[PDB]
Amino acid sequence: SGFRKMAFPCGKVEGCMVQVTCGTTTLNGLWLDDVVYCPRHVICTSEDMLNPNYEDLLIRKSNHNFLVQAGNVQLRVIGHSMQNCVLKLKVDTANPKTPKYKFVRIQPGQTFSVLACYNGSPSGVYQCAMRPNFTIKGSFLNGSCGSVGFNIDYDCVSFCYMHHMELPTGVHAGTDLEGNFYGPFVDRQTAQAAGTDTTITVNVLAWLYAAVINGDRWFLNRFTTTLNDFNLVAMKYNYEPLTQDHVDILGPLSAQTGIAVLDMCASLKELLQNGMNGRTILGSALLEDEFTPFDVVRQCSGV
Amino acid sequence: SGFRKMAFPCGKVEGCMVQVTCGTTTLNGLWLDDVVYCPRHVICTSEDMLNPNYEDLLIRKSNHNFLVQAGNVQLRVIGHSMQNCVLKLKVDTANPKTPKYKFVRIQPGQTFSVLACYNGSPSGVYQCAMRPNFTIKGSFLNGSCGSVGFNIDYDCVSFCYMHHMELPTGVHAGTDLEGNFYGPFVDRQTAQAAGTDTTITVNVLAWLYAAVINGDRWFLNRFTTTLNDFNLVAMKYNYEPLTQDHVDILGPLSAQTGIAVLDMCASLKELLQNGMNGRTILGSALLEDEFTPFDVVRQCSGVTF
Numbered sequence: 001s002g003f004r005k006m007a008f009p010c011g012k013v014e015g016c017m018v019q020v021t022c023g024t025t026t027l028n029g030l031w032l033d034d035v036v037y038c039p040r041h042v043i044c045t046s047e048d049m050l051n052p053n054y055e056d057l058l059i060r061k062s063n064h065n066f067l068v069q070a071g072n073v074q075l076r077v078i079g080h081s082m083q084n085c086v087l088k089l090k091v092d093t094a095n096p097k098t099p100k101y102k103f104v105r106i107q108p109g110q111t112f113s114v115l116a117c118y119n120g121s122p123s124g125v126y127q128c129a130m131r132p133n134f135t136i137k138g139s140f141l142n143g144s145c146g147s148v149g150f151n152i153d154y155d156c157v158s159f160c161y162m163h164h165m166e167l168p169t170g171v172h173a174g175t176d177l178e179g180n181f182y183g184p185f186v187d188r189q190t191a192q193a194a195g196t197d198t199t200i201t202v203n204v205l206a207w208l209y210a211a212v213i214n215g216d217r218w219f220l221n222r223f224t225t226t227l228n229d230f231n232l233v234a235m236k237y238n239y240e241p242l243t244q245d246h247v248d249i250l251g252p253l254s255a256q257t258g259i260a261v262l263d264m265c266a267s268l269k270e271l272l273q274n275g276m277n278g279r280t281i282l283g284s285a286l287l288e289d290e291f292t293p294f295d296v297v298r299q300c301s302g303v
Numbered sequence: 304s305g306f307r308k309m310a311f312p313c314g315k316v317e318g319c320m321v322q323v324t325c326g327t328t329t330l331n332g333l334w335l336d337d338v339v340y341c342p343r344h345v346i347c348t349s350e351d352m353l354n355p356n357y358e359d360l361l362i363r364k365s366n367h368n369f370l371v372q373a374g375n376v377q378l379r380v381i382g383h384s385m386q387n388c389v390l391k392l393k394v395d396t397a398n399p400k401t402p403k404y405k406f407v408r409i410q411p412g413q414t415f416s417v418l419a420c421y422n423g424s425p426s427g428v429y430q431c432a433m434r435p436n437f438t439i440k441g442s443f444l445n446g447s448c449g450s451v452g453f454n455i456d457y458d459c460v461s462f463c464y465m466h467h468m469e470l471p472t473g474v475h476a477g478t479d480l481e482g483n484f485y486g487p488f489v490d491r492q493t494a495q496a497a498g499t500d501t502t503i504t505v506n507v508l509a510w511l512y513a514a515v516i517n518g519d520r521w522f523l524n525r526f527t528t529t530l531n532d533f534n535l536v537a538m539k540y541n542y543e544p545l546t547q548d549h550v551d552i553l554g555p556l557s558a559q560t561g562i563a564v565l566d567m568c569a570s571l572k573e574l575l576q577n578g579m580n581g582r583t584i585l586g587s588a589l590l591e592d593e594f595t596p597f598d599v600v601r602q603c604s605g606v607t608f
């Protein structure tokens with residue numbers, strides 16, 4: 001029993017992080033087989049980063065312009081290309097610690113583990129959720145560009161995120177491993193705003209089931225609601241609408257606890273209209289939305 | 304920027320996790336050089352665990368009754384001994400992935416990363432604080448015993464926790480790597496209850512220095528206090544008393560902000576006595592007590608290992 005924000009063990013990714021330096025600019029890269037992936041803005045100078053014509057800057061670079069260090073060893077770049085915002089540095093040595101891996105694009109509301117690195121050295125690991133406005137609430141300082149987010153299924157690492165930027169509001173943005181940004185952001189040195197953030201409703205409900213499995217029931221009530229009447233109220237509070245697919249994904253948690261999904265929606269509607277009266281749920285004073293149904297099932301199955 | 308509960312990268316520990324079985328009883332162990340460390344109750348049957356005599360139960364066992372597996376590879380056991388509630392099993396292969404390491408016994412309030420494991424396979428990692436009642440608010444399922452907690456300093460892994468028990472209330476209890484429980488618990492299949500918990504004062508202060516560093520400082524008052532007066536007041540709110548070590552580890556954050564520890568204590572004292580007054584700190588109206596001063600430093604300064 002217990003419920004905690006939990007990340008995947010990150011050893012398989014640790015063995016892939018390297019340092020990439022071009023000029024006076026240094027960040028992290030991801031070394032898989034004989035390719036090192038890193039944010040392309042590493043080729044920029046301070047003045048370039050203001051409005052980088054990346055294809056122009058890139059053609060003017062040579063392989064020897066790129067210093068790639070893996071621990072003590074320096075890797076020799078034998079080629080360089082660009083895939084959207086991701087620089088691909090070819091090296092003469094394949095990483096022997098390359099796990100089975102895949103590149104995937106995560107959807108909003110889904111979670112992943114982030115391995116935060118500095119100068120190519122892993123510094124910490126934590127779980128994040130892709131917000132509906134395609135930002136993430138991470139913990140990233142100068143030099144963390146090139147850090148990657150990932151899930152693991154069996155022995156296969158699914159890479160979904162590479163970090164590029166911190167918005168003025170302090171949330172974070174980045175790309176998939178094909179170099180496409182999540183959201184409407186751009187890798188230039190400008191202050192950028194995200195769209196209006198909404199709350200991930202299916203995740204809040206999963207976390208309410210988790211609280212019940214762990215003995216917290218004070219927010220429960222006898223009422224039920226229709227799906228549409230629930231969504232009318234949820235939208236009013238800037239919650240995403242709950243789809244029938246979401247209802248279905250919650251099935252296992254409904255079964256385990258014996259609380260129908262539409263019953264638990266009536267509790268959430270009461271919480272949104274009434275607040276929490278200074279009470280807490282799983283130790284939190286706010287309604288937590290960064291836990292997926294599957295995050296809950298995998299920690300609370302059998303409890 | 305941003306502030307999260309962050310674990311240490313756990314690769315160096317994953318390469319050390321193994322499975323230990325005796326009869327049908329299975330749990331996790333820690334493979335360092337040519338020794339495997341694990342909870343001694345692996346030698347119990349389900350019925351033995353009700354009222355075990357571990358000395359008696361161990362006299363019955365030989366090296367060849369112990370199944371130790373790294374993945375599906377068996378490590379032959381060539382010696383065995385018991386130290387408090389930990390079993391040590393000598394094996395015929397020195398772990399080639401052994402990191403630089405040490406065994407440490409941490410204080411209440413200290414945090415550590417937990418590598419949750421099942422059948423010798425790491426499954427998740429998360430951060431925990433040792434509560435003042437010597438429990439941890441963990442997330443542990445059946446088969447998790449022998450999971451370890453650790454910190455990483457430079458390249459050295461400091462092991463501080465081995466998992467043994469879930470209490471009725473849903474919190475967790477265990478030992479250090481020398482087999483000595485944190486708290487008044489015993490490894491026996493019985494419902495045991497922990498003392499009343501308290502708030503970790505040194506960590507709340509750390510979190511307040513964090514807020515100041517970030518420009519959020521409305522709560523700073525013009526008062527100061529003695530350490531003894533603060534301790535006596537803090538206890539009336541269920542806050543833990545500060546030690547000299549606590550004052551000393553707050554030193555860096557005190558110098559960084561220019562706010563003396565006892566001045567921050569007088570500010571915290573006011574927050575306790577008058578409440579928050581509809582205001583928040585770092586986004587929260589709840590005072591946070593599971594970040595140590597090193598966590599605050601490590602996260603606001605990006606230290607690596």
Ligand SMILES: *[C@@](O)(CO)[C@H](C[C@@H]1CCNC1=O)NC(=O)[C@H](CC(C)C)NC(=O)c1cc2c(OC)cccc2[nH]1
Pocket residue numbers: 026027041049140141142143144145164165166167168172186187188189190191192304
């Ligand atoms: C990478 O380390 C750069 O290599 C760095 C990410 C962070 C810096 C602090 N916390 C982080 O996560 N990323 C940047 O510095 C990016 C670089 C771009 C993509 C070329 N820049 C920003 O994130 C950024 C720029 C600006 C800005 O300008 C003007 C104004 C306001 C906010 C802002 N964020």
Ligand SMILES: *[C@@](O)(CO)[C@H](C[C@@H]1CCNC1=O)NC(=O)[C@H](CC(C)C)NC(=O)c1cc2c(OC)cccc2[nH]1
Pocket residue numbers: 001329330344352443444445446447448449467468469470471475489490491492493494495
């Ligand atoms: C280990 O995996 C045992 O090998 C297991 C830890 C958990 C089980 C569920 N979640 C966990 O973290 N530990 C136990 O099962 C221990 C075994 C002891 C050390 C012999 N027992 C308990 O944790 C336990 C027993 C009882 C109990 O009795 C009856 C009554 C109430 C609570 C309780 N917890």
